Amino acid sequence: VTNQLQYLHKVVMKALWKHQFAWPFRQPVDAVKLGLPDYHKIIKQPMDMGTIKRRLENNYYWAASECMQDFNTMFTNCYIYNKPTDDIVLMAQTLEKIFLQKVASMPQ
Amino acid sequence: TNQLQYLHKVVMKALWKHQFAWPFRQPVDAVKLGLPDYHKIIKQPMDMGTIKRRLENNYYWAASECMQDFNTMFTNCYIYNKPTDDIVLMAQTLEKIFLQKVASMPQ
Numbered sequence: 001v002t003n004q005l006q007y008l009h010k011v012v013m014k015a016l017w018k019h020q021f022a023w024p025f026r027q028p029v030d031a032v033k034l035g036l037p038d039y040h041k042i043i044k045q046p047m048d049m050g051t052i053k054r055r056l057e058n059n060y061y062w063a064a065s066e067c068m069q070d071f072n073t074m075f076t077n078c079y080i081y082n083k084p085t086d087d088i089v090l091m092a093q094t095l096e097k098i099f100l101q102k103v104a105s106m107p108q
Numbered sequence: 109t110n111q112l113q114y115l116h117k118v119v120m121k122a123l124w125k126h127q128f129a130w131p132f133r134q135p136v137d138a139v140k141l142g143l144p145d146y147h148k149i150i151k152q153p154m155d156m157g158t159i160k161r162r163l164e165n166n167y168y169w170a171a172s173e174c175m176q177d178f179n180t181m182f183t184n185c186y187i188y189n190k191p192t193d194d195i196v197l198m199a200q201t202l203e204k205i206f207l208q209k210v211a212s213m214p215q
């Protein structure tokens with residue numbers, strides 16, 4: 001495992017997974033459970049932290065940028081789908097700011 | 109810093125000349141663009157012209173602060189526009205380049 005992917009796993013995912021605002025993002029969006037019948041009409045590439053974490057655990061990624069794009073898709077899906085005023089947007093913004101702060105110190 | 113230099117000369121330069129970058133090179137002009145609700149929804153406007161000027165004038169203390177402004181710029185687009193708007197695709201395309209280039213920044 002590259003230095004970069006080790007960092008994404010040990011530093012970035014570690015910080016984000018345990019965060020108090022992480023829970024809406026720890027599993028795929030369940031549109032039935034959440035009452036969101038248009039979710040998959042709007043969001044064509046669902047992504048969540050559970051998936052990213054499993055991919056890090058299973059050496060799915062070849063480059064760190066690939067993992068970073070998955071985090072990015074997760075956050076962007078939230079901004080695109082939700083109303084600007086929804087609390088979930090605030091939660092995503094908070095997590096993404098940590099993501100970027102940590103990525104500023106990633107190797108290589 | 110070494111990182112701020114990189115964000116200016118490597119990251120911003122690449123984004124700036126991109127064929128999808130023209131809506132992002134200057135602040136959103138809500139009057140000229142006919143967006144009467146833009147500043148009621150978007151409370152922290154950001155654009156690449158502003159970031160570039162901040163880079164030129166040594167406004168940033170750290171690389172992360174600059175990266176946060178890029179992020180705010182893209183996030184504003186996703187929040188304000190309709191999912192089906194072309195500008196969302198343009199922002200997505202630019203943001204993927206941003207993250208690719210950031211992955212190679214000096215640690």
Ligand SMILES: O=c1nc(Nc2cccc(Cl)c2)oc2cc(Cl)oc(=O)c12
Pocket residue numbers: 023024025029034036077078081082088
């Ligand atoms: O991305 C999202 N993730 C979640 N997770 C979630 C939500 C409630 C319970 C549990 Cl266990 C998980 O909920 C959402 C609700 C809405 Cl409205 O928009 C969203 O984009 C998301």
